[PDB]
């Protein structure tokens, strides 16, 4: 899809008005399937490890999030289509430069490839960036062909602040989602009863990320 039009005429107004934006059929079936195969190859070869939290304390991470993950830069062998996904995400964000709130987006995390391996795993209600670590936009791509949420669950429920309805996002094949990462969008992954895959990148606001890095580097 042409990035300029999609960014400026849809993603920008949707993000500013609602803080959440869904783009269905982002890359098309062939590319989505190739991504699914690359992800399943990562799973099958033991690459995933338990998802972790910003601040680890007495409780097991698995009491909080039951997913297993790996980080992808985009250039690894066997991850070329994930890299194309990431570049397509980046292209949309670059065409949004300066139009997403007051943020100035100069960078992002690596891609987090995540799997909830059925069995009722999920993620308790939480905020992606509650204390100002730099993350301003969460971008997620779903690649679950044949997902039937009424049976397998796995719905991402977002509680956008100040709204009269919450937002239920099925983890549908080839769906791209953006939302503000801060406290405006508490959210949860409801229990999944089938293997559920998603790829996430978080985009950074330059000034907030600089302050967060200064805090980390000074203790």
């Amino acid at each position: 899809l042409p990035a300029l039009k999609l960014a400026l005429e849809y993603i920008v107004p949707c993000m500013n008005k609602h803080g959440i934006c869904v783009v269905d059929d982002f890359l098309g079936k062939e590319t989505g399937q190739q991504i699914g195969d690359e992800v399943r190859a990562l799973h099958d070869t033991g690459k995933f490890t338990d998802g972790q939290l910003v601040s680890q304390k007495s409780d097991s991470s698995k009491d909080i999030r039951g997913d297993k993950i790996t980080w992808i830069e985009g250039k690894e062998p066997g991850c070329e289509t994930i890299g194309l996904l990431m570049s397509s995400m980046d292209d949309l964000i670059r065409h949004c430069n300066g139009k997403l709130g007051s943020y100035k987006i100069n960078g992002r995390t690596k891609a987090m490839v995540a799997c909830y391996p059925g069995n009722g795993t999920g993620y308790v209600r939480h905020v992606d960036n509650p204390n100002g670590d730099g993350r301003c936009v969460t971008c997620i791509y779903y690649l679950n062909k044949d997902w039937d949420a009424k049976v397998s669950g796995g719905i991402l429920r977002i509680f956008p602040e100040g709204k009269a309805q919450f937002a239920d996002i099925e983890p549908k094949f080839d769906r791209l989602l953006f939302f503000w990462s801060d406290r405006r969008n508490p959210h949860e992954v409801q229990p999944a009863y089938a293997t559920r895959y998603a790829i996430t990148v978080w985009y950074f606001d330059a000034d907030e990320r600089a302050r967060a890095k200064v805090k980390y580097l000074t203790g």
Binding site: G51, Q52, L53, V54, S55, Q56, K57, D59, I64, R65, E73, D90, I93, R94, I105, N106, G107, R108, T109, K110, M112, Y123, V124, R125, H126, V127, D128, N129, P130, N131, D133, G134, R135, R183, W202, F204, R209, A212, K213, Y216
Partner: peptide, 20 residues
């Protein structure tokens, strides 16, 4: 109130971030 960072998904704080 609960420290929400104990529920937030980890990202690396060191190294670089990917620059756009």
């Amino acid at each position: 109130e609960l420290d929400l960072e104990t529920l937030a998904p980890y990202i690396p704080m060191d190294g670089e971030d990917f620059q756009l």
